[PDB]
Enzyme design. Sequence first.
Site, PDB file in Angstrom:
ATOM      1  N   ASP A  82      -4.525 -19.415   3.318  1.00  0.00           N
ATOM      2  CA  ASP A  82      -4.132 -20.737   2.846  1.00  0.00           C
ATOM      3  C   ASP A  82      -3.926 -21.560   4.126  1.00  0.00           C
ATOM      4  OD1 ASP A  82      -1.185 -20.276   3.663  1.00  0.00           O
ATOM      5  OD2 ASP A  82      -0.510 -20.700   1.699  1.00  0.00           O
ATOM      6  N   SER A 127       5.408   7.265   2.536  1.00  0.00           N
ATOM      7  CA  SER A 127       4.326   8.218   2.688  1.00  0.00           C
ATOM      8  C   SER A 127       3.182   7.705   3.550  1.00  0.00           C
ATOM      9  CB  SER A 127       3.773   8.634   1.323  1.00  0.00           C
ATOM     10  OG  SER A 127       3.112   7.603   0.600  1.00  0.00           O
ATOM     11  N   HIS A 142       0.798  -1.239   0.000  1.00  0.00           N
ATOM     12  CA  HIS A 142       0.000   0.000   0.000  1.00  0.00           C
ATOM     13  C   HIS A 142       0.822   1.277   0.000  1.00  0.00           C
ATOM     14  CE1 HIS A 142      -3.685  -2.378   1.715  1.00  0.00           C
ATOM     15  NE2 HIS A 142      -3.216  -2.845   0.598  1.00  0.00           N
ATOM     16  N   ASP A 143       2.054   1.155   0.464  1.00  0.00           N
ATOM     17  CA  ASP A 143       2.964   2.268   0.357  1.00  0.00           C
ATOM     18  C   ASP A 143       3.536   2.337  -1.076  1.00  0.00           C
ATOM     19  OD1 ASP A 143       4.789   4.421   1.038  1.00  0.00           O
ATOM     20  OD2 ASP A 143       6.333   3.026   1.456  1.00  0.00           O
ATOM     21  N   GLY A 155       5.592   6.526  -4.939  1.00  0.00           N
ATOM     22  CA  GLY A 155       5.969   5.140  -4.816  1.00  0.00           C
ATOM     23  C   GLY A 155       6.316   4.707  -3.412  1.00  0.00           C
ATOM     24  N   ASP A 173       8.127   5.519  -0.943  1.00  0.00           N
ATOM     25  CA  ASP A 173       8.670   6.637  -0.171  1.00  0.00           C
ATOM     26  C   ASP A 173       8.331   6.775   1.335  1.00  0.00           C
ATOM     27  OD1 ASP A 173       5.953   7.210  -0.714  1.00  0.00           O
ATOM     28  OD2 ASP A 173       6.332   9.178  -1.504  1.00  0.00           O
TER      29      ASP A 173
HETATM   30 CA   LIG Z   1       1.384 -20.496   3.262  1.00  0.00          CA
HETATM   31 CA   LIG Z   2       3.812   5.834  -0.782  1.00  0.00          CA
END
Ligand SMILES: [Ca+2]
Ligand SMILES: [Ca+2]
Length: 336
Positions: free
Chosen positions: A194, A71, A48-49, A67, A69
């Site tokens: 899993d 943030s 997510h960053d 990207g 960074d």
């Molecule tokens: Ca696994």
């Molecule tokens: Ca970011």
Amino acid sequence: SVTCPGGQSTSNSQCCVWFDVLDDLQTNFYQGSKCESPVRKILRIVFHDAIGFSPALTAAGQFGGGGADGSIIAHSNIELAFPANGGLTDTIEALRAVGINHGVSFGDLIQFATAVGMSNCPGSPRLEFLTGRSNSSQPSPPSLIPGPGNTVTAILDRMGDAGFSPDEVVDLLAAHSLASQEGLNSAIFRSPLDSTPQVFDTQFYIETLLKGTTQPGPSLGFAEELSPFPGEFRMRSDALLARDSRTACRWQSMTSSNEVMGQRYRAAMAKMSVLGFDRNALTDCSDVIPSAVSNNAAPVIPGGLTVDDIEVSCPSEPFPEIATASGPLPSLAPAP
Ligand SMILES: [Ca+2]
Ligand SMILES: [Ca+2]
Ligand code: HEM
Ligand SMILES: *[C@@H]1O[C@H](CO)[C@@H](O[C@@H]2O[C@H](CO)[C@@H](O)[C@H](O)[C@H]2NC(C)=O)[C@H](O)[C@H]1NC(C)=O
């Protein structure tokens, strides 16, 4: 040559502070070098960053994101309001304090905390680690994170714009091998995706391909699908991606070899760690990252199920002949 204050040997003087943050994270954040919920939360945070990066926005005049960074930490107040960033607050605060304490940039700290967390999980590759990302960031634009209810076309457009081909989207997803959900169906908190949420192995690719048979909790949650057995949660984007013609064959080649999945994962993650940076501007400190214990179990079809229970979606390659277990169907405990 470069002997760090505590006698370890490294490539370059910029790697020495990373042996201190290695000890702080293993002792504190990872509770004695464990592979439990902090590792899983960090793996979600690095994606997510890093994914808040869009060449499309840049091209049309807008700030498209920096990207990888850091943030998400520096502007947590705007980014943790995004739909996709629920349940990350307590982990973002823990990371902010380690980064303020050792004087390392937040983007570097997230990439580092990812390579160290994976070294605690059996089966993991040694992920590349580069130091040098600037600590200054701008808030990520909204709507750049794929959601579990998105179609496969939407997920491939977004990832594609970030720079990943369909094959690398399947490779990146090897991280759902160390995974659970807490906010898609709260009645079944920490249901694994899993049957081995503490082992980085192929099982995730095998088990999302099986026929959806069981409703694991009292009702269905957001973007929940029927799963193959008690306690496992299946989210809609992983089910669709295993079966769609654009990604089905790569998802099928990922089921038989932990060695191939690992190399593929390591290569996609290395690419994703430098989104928004020029890797030739960073210093390589990969050698600060320790080895993971090896995983010796071979891929299997769990609990008596056979190849007749997996929905073969790749129409050109026949399914790998994988081992079967003589079991009654498993029921999974929540991931730790
Ligand atoms: Ca696994
Ligand atoms: Ca970011
Ligand atoms: C195709 C895009 C993907 C989608 C739509 C997606 C979506 C999600 C969702 C909704 C959850 C459950 C969160 C919760 O409710 O607790 C989850 C968990 C997780 N995802 Fe993904 N994911 C994707 C890609 C990835 C990638 C590329 C990585 C990282 C390299 C990743 C790592 C994880 C991990 C480790 C967890 C488990 C977290 C935990 O147990 O607390 N995911 N993902
Ligand atoms: C990286 O930048 C962040 C600011 O964006 C710095 O974080 C702050 O650090 C001070 C003390 O140094 C804390 O009181 C603030 O609460 C922090 N702010 C945030 C948003 O967390 C951080 O110090 C910078 N690190 C370096 C090494 O430059």
